[PDB]
Amino acid sequence: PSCLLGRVYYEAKLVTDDEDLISQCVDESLKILAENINAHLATRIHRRVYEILGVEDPYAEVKARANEVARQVLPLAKEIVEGSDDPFKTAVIVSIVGNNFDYVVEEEFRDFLKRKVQEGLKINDTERIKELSSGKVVYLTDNAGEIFFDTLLMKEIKRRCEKLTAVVRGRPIISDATIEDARLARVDKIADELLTNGKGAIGIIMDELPDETRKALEEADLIVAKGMANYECLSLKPIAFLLTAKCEPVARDIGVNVGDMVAKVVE
Amino acid sequence: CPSCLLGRVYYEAKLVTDDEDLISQCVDESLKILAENINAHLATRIHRRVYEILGVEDPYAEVKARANEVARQVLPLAKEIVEGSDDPFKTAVIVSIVGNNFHKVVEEEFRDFLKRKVQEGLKINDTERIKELSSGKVVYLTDNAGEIFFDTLLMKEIKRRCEKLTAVVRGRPIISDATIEDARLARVDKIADELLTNGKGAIGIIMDELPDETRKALEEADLIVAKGMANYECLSDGSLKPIAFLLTAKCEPVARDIGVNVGDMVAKVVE
Numbered sequence A: 001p002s003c004l005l006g007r008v009y010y011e012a013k014l015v016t017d018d019e020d021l022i023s024q025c026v027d028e029s030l031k032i033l034a035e036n037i038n039a040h041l042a043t044r045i046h047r048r049v050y051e052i053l054g055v056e057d058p059y060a061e062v063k064a065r066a067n068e069v070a071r072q073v074l075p076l077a078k079e080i081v082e083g084s085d086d087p088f089k090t091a092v093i094v095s096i097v098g099n100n101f102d103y104v105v106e107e108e109f110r111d112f113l114k115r116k117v118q119e120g121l122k123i124n125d126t127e128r129i130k131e132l133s134s135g136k137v138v139y140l141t142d143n144a145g146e147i148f149f150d151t152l153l154m155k156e157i158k159r160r161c162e163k164l165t166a167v168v169r170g171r172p173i174i175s176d177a178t179i180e181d182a183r184l185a186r187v188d189k190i191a192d193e194l195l196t197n198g199k200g201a202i203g204i205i206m207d208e209l210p211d212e213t214r215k216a217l218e219e220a221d222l223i224v225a226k227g228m229a230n231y232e233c234l235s236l237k238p239i240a241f242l243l244t245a246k247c248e249p250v251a252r253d254i255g256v257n258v259g260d261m262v263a264k265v266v267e
Numbered sequence B: 001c002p003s004c005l006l007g008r009v010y011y012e013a014k015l016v017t018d019d020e021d022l023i024s025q026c027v028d029e030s031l032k033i034l035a036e037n038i039n040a041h042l043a044t045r046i047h048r049r050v051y052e053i054l055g056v057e058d059p060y061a062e063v064k065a066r067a068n069e070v071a072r073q074v075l076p077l078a079k080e081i082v083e084g085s086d087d088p089f090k091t092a093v094i095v096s097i098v099g100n101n102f103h104k105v106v107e108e109e110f111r112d113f114l115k116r117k118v119q120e121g122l123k124i125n126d127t128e129r130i131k132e133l134s135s136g137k138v139v140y141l142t143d144n145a146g147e148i149f150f151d152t153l154l155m156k157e158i159k160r161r162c163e164k165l166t167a168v169v170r171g172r173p174i175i176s177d178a179t180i181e182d183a184r185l186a187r188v189d190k191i192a193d194e195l196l197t198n199g200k201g202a203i204g205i206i207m208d209e210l211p212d213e214t215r216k217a218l219e220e221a222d223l224i225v226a227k228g229m230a231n232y233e234c235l236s237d238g239s240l241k242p243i244a245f246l247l248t249a250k251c252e253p254v255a256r257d258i259g260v261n262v263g264d265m266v267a268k269v270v271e
Protein backbone atom coordinates (compact mmCIF):
# COMPACT_ATOMS: atom_id res chain seq x y z
CA PRO A 1 0.00 0.00 0.00
CA SER A 2 2.79 2.44 0.93
CA CYS A 3 5.09 1.21 -1.98
CA LEU A 4 2.08 1.43 -4.29
CA LEU A 5 1.63 5.06 -3.47
CA GLY A 6 5.32 5.70 -4.12
CA ARG A 7 5.00 3.83 -7.37
CA VAL A 8 2.07 6.07 -8.38
CA TYR A 9 4.22 9.11 -7.86
CA TYR A 10 7.07 7.53 -9.90
CA GLU A 11 4.77 6.64 -12.89
CA ALA A 12 3.26 10.05 -12.97
CA LYS A 13 6.76 11.58 -12.97
CA LEU A 14 7.74 9.30 -15.87
CA VAL A 15 5.00 10.90 -17.98
CA THR A 16 4.57 14.48 -16.87
CA ASP A 17 5.72 17.50 -14.91
CA ASP A 18 2.27 19.02 -14.29
CA GLU A 19 2.00 19.07 -10.52
CA ASP A 20 -1.79 19.29 -10.81
CA LEU A 21 -1.84 15.93 -12.61
CA ILE A 22 0.74 14.32 -10.37
CA SER A 23 -1.07 15.32 -7.22
CA GLN A 24 -4.40 14.34 -8.78
CA CYS A 25 -2.92 10.86 -9.32
CA VAL A 26 -1.68 10.56 -5.76
CA ASP A 27 -4.83 12.08 -4.29
CA GLU A 28 -7.21 9.84 -6.18
CA SER A 29 -5.05 6.86 -5.23
CA LEU A 30 -5.26 7.83 -1.55
CA LYS A 31 -9.02 7.98 -1.84
CA ILE A 32 -9.20 4.44 -3.22
CA LEU A 33 -6.78 3.02 -0.64
CA ALA A 34 -8.86 4.63 2.12
CA GLU A 35 -12.11 3.12 0.87
CA ASN A 36 -10.77 -0.48 0.33
CA ILE A 37 -2.33 -4.61 -1.62
CA ASN A 38 -4.83 -6.79 -3.53
CA ALA A 39 -4.35 -7.38 -7.35
CA HIS A 40 -7.86 -5.95 -8.03
CA LEU A 41 -6.99 -2.82 -6.00
CA ALA A 42 -3.54 -2.16 -7.51
CA THR A 43 -5.01 -2.72 -10.97
CA ARG A 44 -7.89 -0.35 -10.29
CA ILE A 45 -5.45 2.28 -8.98
CA HIS A 46 -2.97 2.10 -11.90
CA ARG A 47 -5.74 2.22 -14.43
CA ARG A 48 -7.19 5.32 -12.85
CA VAL A 49 -3.75 6.93 -12.74
CA TYR A 50 -3.06 6.19 -16.39
CA GLU A 51 -6.45 7.64 -17.24
CA ILE A 52 -5.67 10.89 -15.40
CA LEU A 53 -2.31 11.09 -17.17
CA GLY A 54 -3.80 10.22 -20.55
CA VAL A 55 -1.06 7.61 -21.03
CA GLU A 56 -1.04 4.04 -22.30
CA ASP A 57 2.43 2.93 -21.21
CA PRO A 58 4.41 5.09 -18.81
CA TYR A 59 7.01 2.32 -18.45
CA ALA A 60 7.62 1.98 -22.22
CA GLU A 61 11.20 3.10 -22.01
CA VAL A 62 11.97 1.27 -18.77
CA LYS A 63 10.63 -1.98 -20.17
CA ALA A 64 12.62 -1.47 -23.44
CA ARG A 65 15.90 -1.16 -21.53
CA ALA A 66 15.17 -4.37 -19.64
CA ASN A 67 14.46 -6.12 -22.94
CA GLU A 68 17.68 -4.70 -24.38
CA VAL A 69 19.92 -5.94 -21.57
CA ALA A 70 18.18 -9.30 -21.52
CA ARG A 71 18.77 -9.66 -25.25
CA GLN A 72 22.47 -8.76 -24.79
CA VAL A 73 23.09 -11.36 -22.05
CA LEU A 74 20.71 -14.16 -22.94
CA PRO A 75 23.26 -16.09 -25.04
CA LEU A 76 25.39 -16.16 -21.91
CA ALA A 77 22.49 -17.33 -19.80
CA LYS A 78 21.97 -20.11 -22.32
CA GLU A 79 25.61 -21.07 -21.99
CA ILE A 80 25.13 -21.56 -18.27
CA VAL A 81 21.93 -23.61 -18.68
CA GLU A 82 23.38 -25.87 -21.42
CA GLY A 83 26.60 -26.24 -19.46
CA SER A 84 25.05 -27.07 -16.06
CA ASP A 85 24.58 -30.55 -14.55
CA ASP A 86 20.79 -29.92 -14.27
CA PRO A 87 19.69 -27.66 -17.15
CA PHE A 88 16.08 -27.62 -16.13
CA LYS A 89 16.82 -26.39 -12.59
CA THR A 90 19.34 -23.89 -13.95
CA ALA A 91 16.71 -22.66 -16.42
CA VAL A 92 14.33 -22.16 -13.49
CA ILE A 93 16.93 -20.15 -11.60
CA VAL A 94 17.68 -18.04 -14.68
CA SER A 95 13.97 -17.28 -15.26
CA ILE A 96 13.72 -16.05 -11.65
CA VAL A 97 16.86 -13.93 -11.37
CA GLY A 98 17.95 -12.81 -14.84
CA ASN A 99 16.02 -9.55 -14.76
CA ASN A 100 17.15 -8.82 -11.14
CA PHE A 101 20.59 -8.02 -12.53
CA ASP A 102 21.87 -4.43 -11.87
CA TYR A 103 23.10 -2.31 -14.86
CA VAL A 104 30.98 -4.55 -20.22
CA VAL A 105 27.73 -5.57 -18.49
CA GLU A 106 28.13 -9.03 -20.10
CA GLU A 107 31.00 -10.06 -17.77
CA GLU A 108 29.25 -8.72 -14.64
CA PHE A 109 26.06 -10.68 -15.40
CA ARG A 110 28.13 -13.88 -15.77
CA ASP A 111 29.30 -13.37 -12.16
CA PHE A 112 25.81 -12.47 -10.94
CA LEU A 113 24.19 -15.52 -12.46
CA LYS A 114 26.97 -17.89 -11.35
CA ARG A 115 26.53 -16.50 -7.79
CA LYS A 116 22.73 -16.99 -7.81
CA VAL A 117 23.17 -20.57 -9.01
CA GLN A 118 25.59 -21.26 -6.12
CA GLU A 119 23.03 -19.91 -3.65
CA GLY A 120 20.30 -22.04 -5.24
CA LEU A 121 16.60 -22.26 -4.46
CA LYS A 122 15.53 -22.07 -0.80
CA ILE A 123 12.49 -24.01 -1.99
CA ASN A 124 13.44 -26.41 -4.78
CA ASP A 125 10.51 -28.35 -6.26
CA THR A 126 12.11 -28.37 -9.72
CA GLU A 127 12.10 -32.15 -10.09
CA ARG A 128 8.38 -32.23 -9.53
CA ILE A 129 7.95 -29.30 -11.96
CA LYS A 130 9.93 -31.23 -14.54
CA GLU A 131 7.69 -34.28 -13.92
CA LEU A 132 4.46 -32.37 -14.43
CA SER A 133 5.79 -30.62 -17.54
CA SER A 134 4.88 -33.70 -19.63
CA GLY A 135 1.24 -32.50 -19.76
CA LYS A 136 -0.53 -29.38 -21.09
CA VAL A 137 1.46 -26.50 -19.58
CA VAL A 138 0.50 -22.85 -19.16
CA TYR A 139 3.30 -20.38 -18.61
CA LEU A 140 2.10 -17.19 -16.92
CA THR A 141 4.70 -14.47 -17.35
CA ASP A 142 5.45 -11.32 -15.35
CA ASN A 143 7.82 -8.50 -16.49
CA ALA A 144 9.48 -7.36 -19.69
CA GLY A 145 13.19 -8.29 -19.73
CA GLU A 146 12.30 -11.25 -17.56
CA ILE A 147 10.30 -12.74 -20.44
CA PHE A 148 13.53 -13.19 -22.42
CA PHE A 149 14.90 -15.31 -19.57
CA ASP A 150 11.57 -17.17 -19.38
CA THR A 151 12.16 -18.44 -22.95
CA LEU A 152 14.98 -20.67 -21.66
CA LEU A 153 12.64 -22.45 -19.28
CA MET A 154 10.00 -22.65 -22.03
CA LYS A 155 12.46 -24.49 -24.29
CA GLU A 156 13.22 -26.95 -21.49
CA ILE A 157 9.51 -27.43 -20.88
CA LYS A 158 9.01 -27.73 -24.65
CA ARG A 159 11.21 -30.90 -24.63
CA ARG A 160 8.54 -32.80 -22.61
CA CYS A 161 5.11 -31.22 -22.86
CA GLU A 162 1.97 -32.09 -24.80
CA LYS A 163 1.34 -28.35 -25.23
CA LEU A 164 2.70 -24.98 -24.06
CA THR A 165 0.52 -21.90 -23.69
CA ALA A 166 2.11 -18.56 -22.73
CA VAL A 167 0.01 -15.84 -21.10
CA VAL A 168 0.92 -12.15 -21.04
CA ARG A 169 -0.97 -8.97 -20.31
CA GLY A 170 -3.54 -7.74 -22.81
CA ARG A 171 -2.63 -4.09 -22.08
CA PRO A 172 0.41 -2.44 -20.57
CA ILE A 173 0.33 -2.13 -16.81
CA ILE A 174 3.48 -1.31 -14.90
CA SER A 175 6.45 -3.32 -16.31
CA ASP A 176 4.36 -6.38 -17.20
CA ALA A 177 5.14 -8.14 -20.47
CA THR A 178 2.55 -7.64 -23.16
CA ILE A 179 2.12 -9.56 -26.36
CA GLU A 180 4.69 -7.32 -28.14
CA ASP A 181 7.29 -8.17 -25.46
CA ALA A 182 6.52 -11.82 -26.12
CA ARG A 183 7.08 -11.36 -29.85
CA LEU A 184 10.37 -9.55 -29.22
CA ALA A 185 11.49 -12.53 -27.11
CA ARG A 186 10.16 -15.01 -29.71
CA VAL A 187 7.71 -16.59 -27.26
CA ASP A 188 5.33 -16.99 -30.22
CA LYS A 189 7.93 -19.29 -31.87
CA ILE A 190 8.47 -21.45 -28.85
CA ALA A 191 5.00 -21.78 -27.32
CA ASP A 192 2.13 -23.44 -29.15
CA GLU A 193 -0.28 -20.66 -28.18
CA LEU A 194 0.19 -17.09 -27.00
CA LEU A 195 -2.67 -15.57 -25.02
CA THR A 196 -3.57 -12.59 -22.85
CA ASN A 197 -5.14 -12.15 -19.45
CA GLY A 198 -7.64 -9.76 -21.06
CA LYS A 199 -7.73 -6.07 -20.13
CA GLY A 200 -4.22 -6.33 -18.64
CA ALA A 201 -4.55 -6.77 -14.90
CA ILE A 202 -1.79 -7.06 -12.37
CA GLY A 203 -1.89 -10.71 -11.48
CA ILE A 204 -4.95 -12.59 -12.64
CA ILE A 205 -8.52 -11.45 -12.40
CA MET A 206 -10.70 -14.41 -13.36
CA ASP A 207 -13.60 -12.12 -14.43
CA GLU A 208 -11.35 -10.49 -17.05
CA LEU A 209 -9.91 -13.57 -18.75
CA PRO A 210 -10.81 -14.15 -22.39
CA ASP A 211 -12.60 -17.44 -22.80
CA GLU A 212 -9.63 -19.06 -24.64
CA THR A 213 -7.27 -18.22 -21.73
CA ARG A 214 -9.64 -19.29 -19.01
CA LYS A 215 -10.12 -22.66 -20.72
CA ALA A 216 -6.35 -23.10 -21.09
CA LEU A 217 -5.88 -22.40 -17.36
CA GLU A 218 -8.63 -24.82 -16.27
CA GLU A 219 -7.40 -27.65 -18.60
CA ALA A 220 -3.70 -27.18 -17.74
CA ASP A 221 -1.88 -30.11 -16.23
CA LEU A 222 0.62 -27.51 -14.85
CA ILE A 223 0.61 -23.75 -14.49
CA VAL A 224 3.99 -22.00 -14.27
CA ALA A 225 3.50 -18.61 -12.64
CA LYS A 226 6.17 -15.93 -12.36
CA GLY A 227 6.54 -13.44 -9.54
CA MET A 228 4.76 -12.10 -6.51
CA ALA A 229 1.51 -10.71 -7.88
CA ASN A 230 0.78 -14.00 -9.67
CA TYR A 231 1.48 -15.96 -6.53
CA GLU A 232 -0.74 -13.73 -4.43
CA CYS A 233 -3.63 -14.12 -6.91
CA LEU A 234 -3.38 -17.86 -7.46
CA SER A 235 -2.71 -19.22 -3.94
CA LEU A 236 -6.18 -23.81 -10.11
CA LYS A 237 -3.71 -26.61 -9.48
CA PRO A 238 -1.10 -27.97 -9.83
CA ILE A 239 0.75 -24.72 -9.98
CA ALA A 240 4.45 -23.83 -9.72
CA PHE A 241 5.38 -20.40 -8.36
CA LEU A 242 8.79 -19.17 -9.49
CA LEU A 243 9.74 -15.96 -7.74
CA THR A 244 12.04 -14.11 -5.37
CA ALA A 245 10.52 -13.14 -2.06
CA LYS A 246 11.27 -9.42 -2.21
CA CYS A 247 8.93 -8.44 0.74
CA GLU A 248 8.18 -9.54 4.29
CA PRO A 249 4.51 -10.24 3.48
CA VAL A 250 5.32 -12.54 0.57
CA ALA A 251 8.18 -14.19 2.42
CA ARG A 252 6.01 -14.98 5.48
CA ASP A 253 3.17 -16.21 3.20
CA ILE A 254 5.50 -18.68 1.42
CA GLY A 255 7.64 -19.56 4.44
CA VAL A 256 11.07 -18.25 3.37
CA ASN A 257 13.22 -15.23 4.18
CA VAL A 258 13.41 -12.07 2.13
CA GLY A 259 15.66 -12.43 -0.93
CA ASP A 260 15.12 -16.21 -1.05
CA MET A 261 14.50 -17.72 -4.46
CA VAL A 262 11.51 -20.02 -4.71
CA ALA A 263 10.30 -22.66 -7.13
CA LYS A 264 7.29 -23.95 -5.18
CA VAL A 265 4.71 -26.44 -6.41
CA VAL A 266 1.27 -26.41 -4.89
CA GLU A 267 0.06 -29.80 -6.01
CA CYS B 1 11.79 12.92 -47.09
CA PRO B 2 14.24 10.11 -46.20
CA SER B 3 16.41 12.74 -44.39
CA CYS B 4 13.56 13.50 -42.01
CA LEU B 5 12.90 9.78 -41.48
CA LEU B 6 16.51 9.15 -40.64
CA GLY B 7 16.55 12.03 -38.18
CA ARG B 8 13.38 10.71 -36.65
CA VAL B 9 14.94 7.27 -36.20
CA TYR B 10 17.76 8.93 -34.24
CA TYR B 11 15.22 10.83 -32.13
CA GLU B 12 13.10 7.65 -31.34
CA ALA B 13 16.17 5.72 -30.36
CA LYS B 14 17.29 8.55 -28.07
CA LEU B 15 13.84 8.60 -26.50
CA VAL B 16 14.45 5.01 -25.40
CA THR B 17 18.13 4.52 -24.72
CA ASP B 18 21.63 5.90 -24.35
CA ASP B 19 23.44 2.82 -25.75
CA GLU B 20 25.32 4.13 -28.83
CA ASP B 21 25.66 0.63 -30.21
CA LEU B 22 21.88 0.30 -30.29
CA ILE B 23 21.35 3.82 -31.60
CA SER B 24 23.91 3.45 -34.33
CA GLN B 25 22.50 0.05 -35.14
CA CYS B 26 19.07 1.65 -35.67
CA VAL B 27 20.45 4.34 -37.91
CA ASP B 28 22.70 1.98 -39.83
CA GLU B 29 19.97 -0.61 -40.53
CA SER B 30 17.67 2.25 -41.57
CA LEU B 31 20.27 3.42 -44.06
CA LYS B 32 20.63 -0.06 -45.54
CA ILE B 33 16.86 -0.22 -46.06
CA LEU B 34 16.71 3.22 -47.64
CA ALA B 35 19.45 2.27 -50.03
CA GLU B 36 17.78 -1.07 -51.00
CA ASN B 37 14.28 0.46 -51.52
CA ILE B 38 9.10 7.75 -48.24
CA ASN B 39 6.38 5.05 -48.91
CA ALA B 40 4.10 4.01 -45.96
CA HIS B 41 5.36 0.46 -46.37
CA LEU B 42 8.95 1.67 -46.14
CA ALA B 43 8.54 3.95 -43.16
CA THR B 44 6.49 1.24 -41.41
CA ARG B 45 9.13 -1.38 -42.13
CA ILE B 46 11.91 0.95 -40.86
CA HIS B 47 10.22 1.97 -37.60
CA ARG B 48 9.28 -1.64 -36.88
CA ARG B 49 12.86 -2.70 -37.36
CA VAL B 50 14.09 0.14 -35.17
CA TYR B 51 11.56 -0.72 -32.44
CA GLU B 52 12.82 -4.33 -32.57
CA ILE B 53 16.45 -3.35 -32.16
CA LEU B 54 15.46 -1.11 -29.23
CA GLY B 55 13.27 -3.79 -27.67
CA VAL B 56 10.57 -1.14 -27.31
CA GLU B 57 6.78 -1.07 -27.97
CA ASP B 58 6.05 2.70 -27.70
CA PRO B 59 8.98 5.08 -27.48
CA TYR B 60 6.48 7.96 -27.93
CA ALA B 61 4.35 7.03 -24.97
CA GLU B 62 5.23 10.10 -22.89
CA VAL B 63 5.15 12.46 -25.91
CA LYS B 64 1.71 11.23 -26.91
CA ALA B 65 0.51 11.53 -23.31
CA ARG B 66 1.45 15.21 -23.12
CA ALA B 67 -0.39 15.89 -26.36
CA ASN B 68 -3.45 14.13 -24.91
CA GLU B 69 -3.12 16.24 -21.79
CA VAL B 70 -2.99 19.62 -23.58
CA ALA B 71 -5.75 18.63 -25.93
CA ARG B 72 -7.91 17.77 -22.89
CA GLN B 73 -7.15 21.09 -21.30
CA VAL B 74 -8.12 23.23 -24.33
CA LEU B 75 -10.86 21.09 -25.91
CA PRO B 76 -13.71 22.84 -24.09
CA LEU B 77 -12.47 26.05 -25.68
CA ALA B 78 -12.31 24.47 -29.11
CA LYS B 79 -15.90 23.37 -28.59
CA GLU B 80 -16.89 26.97 -27.78
CA ILE B 81 -15.46 28.12 -31.11
CA VAL B 82 -17.24 25.39 -33.10
CA GLU B 83 -20.63 25.93 -31.44
CA GLY B 84 -20.19 29.72 -31.61
CA SER B 85 -19.26 29.89 -35.31
CA ASP B 86 -21.58 30.58 -38.24
CA ASP B 87 -20.62 27.19 -39.88
CA PRO B 88 -19.87 24.71 -37.09
CA PHE B 89 -19.16 21.87 -39.50
CA LYS B 90 -16.41 23.74 -41.33
CA THR B 91 -15.00 25.10 -38.08
CA ALA B 92 -14.98 21.54 -36.69
CA VAL B 93 -13.03 20.49 -39.81
CA ILE B 94 -10.48 23.27 -39.27
CA VAL B 95 -10.14 22.43 -35.55
CA SER B 96 -9.50 18.73 -36.31
CA ILE B 97 -6.70 19.74 -38.71
CA VAL B 98 -5.03 22.32 -36.41
CA GLY B 99 -5.41 19.90 -33.51
CA ASN B 100 -2.61 18.14 -35.52
CA ASN B 101 -0.40 21.31 -35.00
CA PHE B 102 0.40 23.73 -32.11
CA HIS B 103 2.79 26.22 -20.22
CA LYS B 104 0.46 26.86 -17.24
CA VAL B 105 -1.76 29.46 -18.97
CA VAL B 106 -1.66 28.06 -22.57
CA GLU B 107 -5.53 28.18 -22.64
CA GLU B 108 -5.57 31.87 -23.69
CA GLU B 109 -2.75 31.41 -26.28
CA PHE B 110 -4.50 28.52 -28.05
CA ARG B 111 -7.67 30.71 -28.27
CA ASP B 112 -5.57 33.10 -30.36
CA PHE B 113 -3.98 30.33 -32.47
CA LEU B 114 -7.33 28.74 -33.31
CA LYS B 115 -8.99 32.08 -34.02
CA ARG B 116 -6.13 32.84 -36.45
CA LYS B 117 -6.28 29.54 -38.28
CA VAL B 118 -10.05 29.97 -38.77
CA GLN B 119 -9.39 33.44 -40.23
CA GLU B 120 -6.88 31.93 -42.68
CA GLY B 121 -9.40 29.24 -43.61
CA LEU B 122 -8.95 26.25 -45.93
CA LYS B 123 -7.03 26.70 -49.19
CA ILE B 124 -9.11 23.83 -50.53
CA ASN B 125 -12.55 23.91 -49.01
CA ASP B 126 -14.77 20.96 -49.87
CA THR B 127 -16.54 20.98 -46.51
CA GLU B 128 -20.02 21.43 -47.99
CA ARG B 129 -19.61 18.29 -50.00
CA ILE B 130 -18.15 16.47 -46.98
CA LYS B 131 -21.19 17.52 -44.96
CA GLU B 132 -23.44 16.29 -47.82
CA LEU B 133 -21.74 12.87 -47.93
CA SER B 134 -21.89 12.54 -44.12
CA SER B 135 -25.49 11.36 -44.28
CA GLY B 136 -24.25 7.85 -45.14
CA LYS B 137 -22.00 5.25 -43.56
CA VAL B 138 -18.86 7.13 -42.47
CA VAL B 139 -15.38 5.87 -41.65
CA TYR B 140 -13.11 8.23 -39.74
CA LEU B 141 -9.46 7.36 -40.15
CA THR B 142 -7.50 9.12 -37.39
CA ASP B 143 -3.86 10.08 -37.22
CA ASN B 144 -2.08 11.31 -34.01
CA ALA B 145 -2.69 11.30 -30.29
CA GLY B 146 -3.72 14.76 -29.06
CA GLU B 147 -5.26 15.37 -32.46
CA ILE B 148 -7.84 12.65 -31.80
CA PHE B 149 -9.40 14.76 -29.04
CA PHE B 150 -10.02 17.50 -31.62
CA ASP B 151 -11.30 14.89 -34.09
CA THR B 152 -14.14 14.16 -31.65
CA LEU B 153 -15.64 17.57 -32.44
CA LEU B 154 -15.92 16.71 -36.11
CA MET B 155 -17.24 13.23 -35.22
CA LYS B 156 -20.05 14.81 -33.24
CA GLU B 157 -20.99 17.02 -36.20
CA ILE B 158 -20.88 13.99 -38.50
CA LYS B 159 -22.91 12.06 -35.95
CA ARG B 160 -25.81 14.50 -36.40
CA ARG B 161 -26.34 13.23 -39.96
CA CYS B 162 -24.83 9.81 -40.57
CA GLU B 163 -26.32 6.31 -40.85
CA LYS B 164 -23.17 5.10 -39.09
CA LEU B 165 -19.80 6.20 -37.83
CA THR B 166 -16.75 3.96 -37.68
CA ALA B 167 -13.49 5.22 -36.23
CA VAL B 168 -10.20 3.58 -37.11
CA VAL B 169 -6.99 3.88 -35.15
CA ARG B 170 -3.72 1.96 -35.03
CA GLY B 171 -3.70 -1.57 -33.79
CA ARG B 172 -0.20 -1.10 -32.35
CA PRO B 173 1.85 1.93 -31.41
CA ILE B 174 3.87 3.53 -34.17
CA ILE B 175 5.31 6.99 -33.88
CA SER B 176 2.64 9.30 -32.29
CA ASP B 177 -0.33 7.68 -33.96
CA ALA B 178 -3.45 7.23 -31.90
CA THR B 179 -4.14 3.72 -30.74
CA ILE B 180 -7.27 2.27 -29.24
CA GLU B 181 -6.36 3.55 -25.73
CA ASP B 182 -5.97 7.08 -27.12
CA ALA B 183 -9.47 6.77 -28.57
CA ARG B 184 -10.87 5.60 -25.30
CA LEU B 185 -9.23 8.53 -23.52
CA ALA B 186 -10.98 10.88 -26.03
CA ARG B 187 -14.26 8.95 -25.70
CA VAL B 188 -14.31 8.04 -29.40
CA ASP B 189 -15.91 4.74 -28.36
CA LYS B 190 -18.85 6.74 -26.95
CA ILE B 191 -19.38 8.84 -30.05
CA ALA B 192 -18.71 6.36 -32.86
CA ASP B 193 -20.83 3.32 -33.44
CA GLU B 194 -17.77 1.13 -34.03
CA LEU B 195 -14.08 1.49 -33.09
CA LEU B 196 -11.65 -0.53 -35.15
CA THR B 197 -7.93 -0.75 -35.88
CA ASN B 198 -5.83 -0.95 -39.01
CA GLY B 199 -4.35 -4.19 -37.73
CA LYS B 200 -0.63 -4.50 -37.00
CA GLY B 201 -0.25 -0.71 -36.70
CA ALA B 202 1.04 0.61 -39.97
CA ILE B 203 1.82 4.19 -40.78
CA GLY B 204 -0.96 4.97 -43.19
CA ILE B 205 -3.03 2.07 -44.42
CA ILE B 206 -1.61 -1.21 -45.67
CA MET B 207 -4.54 -3.10 -47.12
CA ASP B 208 -2.86 -6.50 -46.54
CA GLU B 209 -2.84 -5.82 -42.80
CA LEU B 210 -6.39 -4.71 -42.16
CA PRO B 211 -8.60 -6.94 -40.05
CA ASP B 212 -11.59 -8.28 -42.03
CA GLU B 213 -14.00 -6.06 -40.08
CA THR B 214 -12.04 -2.87 -40.88
CA ARG B 215 -11.55 -3.73 -44.54
CA LYS B 216 -15.31 -4.31 -44.93
CA ALA B 217 -16.11 -1.03 -43.23
CA LEU B 218 -13.75 0.84 -45.60
CA GLU B 219 -15.20 -0.88 -48.70
CA GLU B 220 -18.82 -0.30 -47.58
CA ALA B 221 -18.28 3.36 -46.59
CA ASP B 222 -20.21 6.12 -48.29
CA LEU B 223 -17.46 8.45 -47.02
CA ILE B 224 -14.01 7.95 -45.63
CA VAL B 225 -12.59 10.87 -43.61
CA ALA B 226 -8.81 10.58 -43.53
CA LYS B 227 -6.51 12.70 -41.40
CA GLY B 228 -2.98 13.76 -42.20
CA MET B 229 -0.32 13.23 -44.76
CA ALA B 230 0.46 9.51 -44.47
CA ASN B 231 -3.21 8.61 -44.88
CA TYR B 232 -3.42 10.84 -47.97
CA GLU B 233 -0.35 9.30 -49.51
CA CYS B 234 -1.74 5.76 -49.06
CA LEU B 235 -5.32 6.40 -50.19
CA SER B 236 -5.00 9.21 -52.72
CA ASP B 237 -4.83 6.87 -55.78
CA GLY B 238 -8.41 6.29 -55.01
CA SER B 239 -9.37 2.62 -54.98
CA LEU B 240 -11.58 3.67 -51.96
CA LYS B 241 -13.82 6.69 -52.63
CA PRO B 242 -15.44 9.06 -51.96
CA ILE B 243 -12.73 10.11 -49.56
CA ALA B 244 -12.04 13.43 -47.80
CA PHE B 245 -8.45 14.34 -46.90
CA LEU B 246 -8.12 16.69 -43.94
CA LEU B 247 -4.53 17.78 -43.49
CA THR B 248 -1.95 20.53 -43.50
CA ALA B 249 0.60 20.35 -46.34
CA LYS B 250 3.72 20.45 -44.16
CA CYS B 251 6.18 19.56 -46.98
CA GLU B 252 6.88 20.38 -50.62
CA PRO B 253 6.16 16.87 -51.94
CA VAL B 254 2.69 16.65 -50.38
CA ALA B 255 1.91 20.27 -51.22
CA ARG B 256 2.80 19.69 -54.90
CA ASP B 257 0.80 16.38 -54.95
CA ILE B 258 -2.37 18.13 -53.72
CA GLY B 259 -1.87 21.47 -55.45
CA VAL B 260 -1.46 23.82 -52.50
CA ASN B 261 1.47 25.71 -50.95
CA VAL B 262 3.28 24.56 -47.82
CA GLY B 263 1.35 25.36 -44.63
CA ASP B 264 -1.98 25.42 -46.52
CA MET B 265 -4.82 23.62 -44.81
CA VAL B 266 -6.87 21.23 -46.89
CA ALA B 267 -10.23 19.55 -46.73
CA LYS B 268 -10.23 17.86 -50.11
CA VAL B 269 -12.79 15.37 -51.41
CA VAL B 270 -11.79 12.90 -54.12
CA GLU B 271 -14.48 10.76 -55.77
Ligand SMILES: [Cl-]
Pocket: A048
Ligand atom coordinates in the same frame (compact mmCIF):
# COMPACT_ATOMS: atom_id res chain seq x y z
CL1 LIG C 1 -11.98 5.06 -10.33
